[PDB]
């Protein structure tokens, strides 16, 4: 540390280096609930989490109960230990509440005043955050597994919806259009994800074992089908020997991660679909529904956090190296989300907990001359062989 501080003060190293090094060290030090609980509002499993992109203060949660909960993550108490309290909820008393489990919540990418929700009740809903009233509602023939709004598109406001139907659907919130379908897939579409680099490029994953990249401006059909063997454009390509149930672009958009029920994670070049041949080993993935997982941002290494049964596995994206297993939950983890500002990970599970994983690099320090106001050696940490 003191070396980094000296090098920064003297301009020997760019201020980038201390910042990225310490961010990486913090990710390596994640510990369960060290400073922080999250308030138990849900009665069911936590299907989905989304941290607000503007300030990172607020987290939406959706669950198998159909409830949507909005949490405040900032410690506005003066204590070193605190609870992330629920600001407000769309509970079962609300008229517009979802009838069946809520499978994706996403903030509007450009300000916090609106958010979107989807559910196995075959709806996509648009919510006014200040009032928690729906502004628009879209209905579908089939249960929605996933939806996404483009994180970078200013030009268009399209929601991609993946359903049990074989056709991807696109809803235009500006016009209210929901007629536009993409017709290339053959089974249920389990994950959809817009490129963070390009306004118009949508990745889609399906139980047909295919990941397809689309340019939604075109009348032409899809661009690229990912072939895990690298050899041919559509006739037989598969990304996994199983269902493909999760997508995550890397934070630069240059690669796409995919996870599937073959228990493998695979890294792809997003500009042409080449399998980069990074091998992570067995990544346990039994999930028959979409799996949400996340990369880090702003670290010296790009990490990926992936549900691994009841654990969260951490890998280095490019090296394939398994770094740690975060070992908290009692049932399968369904989502995790990364707070980029402070390198804190939140995780939802079918055990109904939301758990915070927080960098725990060192303890509060005593003064040895104190009587009892020290940083206490609690007797729970003591042996008792007598």
């Amino acid at each position: 540390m003191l070396g980094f501080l000296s090098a920064r003060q003297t301009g020997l190293e760019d201020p980038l280096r201390l910042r990225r090094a310490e961010s990486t060290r913090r990710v390596l030090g994640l510990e369960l609930n060290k400073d922080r609980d999250v308030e138990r509002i849900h009665g069911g499993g936590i299907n989905t989490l989304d941290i607000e992109p503007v300030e990172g203060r607020y987290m939406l949660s959706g669950g198998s109960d159909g409830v949507i909960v909005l949490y405040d993550l900032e410690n506005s108490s003066r204590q070193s230990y605190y609870t992330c309290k629920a600001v407000c909820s769309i509970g079962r008393d609300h008229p517009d509440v979802h009838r069946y489990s809520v499978e994706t919540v996403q903030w509007y990418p450009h300000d916090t005043g609106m958010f979107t929700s989807s559910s196995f009740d075959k709806t996509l809903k648009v919510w006014d955050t200040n009032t928690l009233q729906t502004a628009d509602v879209f209905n579908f023939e089939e249960t929605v597994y996933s939806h996404h709004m483009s994180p970078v598109s200013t030009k268009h406001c399209l929601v991609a919806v993946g359903t049990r139907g074989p056709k991807v659907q696109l809803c235009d919130l500006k016009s209210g259009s929901c007629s536009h379908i993409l017709q290339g897939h053959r089974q249920e579409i389990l994950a959809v994800s817009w490129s963070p680099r390009y306004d118009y490029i949508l990745a889609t994953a399906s139980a047909d074992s295919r990941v397809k990249l689309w340019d939604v401006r075109r009348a032409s059909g899809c661009l690229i089908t990912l072939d895990q063997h690298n050899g041919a454009v559509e006739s037989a390509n598969t990304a996994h020997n199983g269902k493909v149930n999760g997508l995550c672009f890397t934070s630069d958009g240059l690669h796409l991660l995919t996870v599937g029920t073959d228990n493998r994670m695979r890294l792809w070049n997003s500009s042409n679909g080449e399998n980069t041949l990074v091998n992570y080993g067995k990544v346990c993935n039994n999930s028959k529904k979409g799996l949400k997982f996340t990369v880090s941002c702003g670290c010296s290494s790009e990490f990926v956090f992936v549900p691994y049964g009841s654990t969260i596995a951490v890998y280095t994206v490019y090296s394939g190296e398994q770094i740690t297993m975060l070992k908290g939950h009692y049932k399968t983890v369904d989502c995790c989300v990364f707070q980029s500002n402070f390198q804190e990970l939140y995780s939802g599970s079918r055990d109904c907990n939301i758990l915070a994983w927080v960098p725990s690099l060192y303890e509060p320090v005593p003064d040895d001359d104190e009587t009892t106001t020290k940083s206490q050696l609690n007797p729970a940490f003591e042996d008792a062989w007598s």
């Binding site: 235009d172 500006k174 016009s175 209210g176 259009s177 007629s179 536009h180 379908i181």
Partner: protein, 99 residues
């Protein structure tokens, strides 16, 4: 625009059923919405100028177009009345024949 059956259910029926003067207020609103949605979906891909929108391509002289309502002659009225009182028209209204 999706598949034809879906398009018919989402636009053709709602927009048609709100053109009637006996359409209920909910139908009139639903039609107005569906027409706005359809018009916004097709707009980028349909380019349509009218002659009133652009005076560059000359101008036509004025058109007077009128509808003249004629009467049936008495024998024509008999023939028509006897046909609508016919059992062929009964078979038509009873669904035994196509209209």
């Amino acid at each position: 625009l999706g598949t034809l059956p879906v398009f018919m259910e989402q636009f053709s029926v709602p927009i048609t059923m709100g053109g009637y003067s006996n359409a209920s207020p909910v139908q009139v609103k639903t039609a107005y919405k569906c027409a706005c949605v359809l018009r916004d979906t097709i707009n980028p891909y349909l380019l349509r100028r009218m002659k009133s929108d652009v005076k560059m391509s000359l101008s036509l002289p004025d058109k007077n177009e009128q509808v003249l309502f004629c009467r049936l002659t008495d024998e024509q009225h008999k023939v028509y009345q006897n046909f609508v009182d016919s059992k062929e028209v009964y078979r038509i209204l009873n669904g035994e024949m196509q209209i």
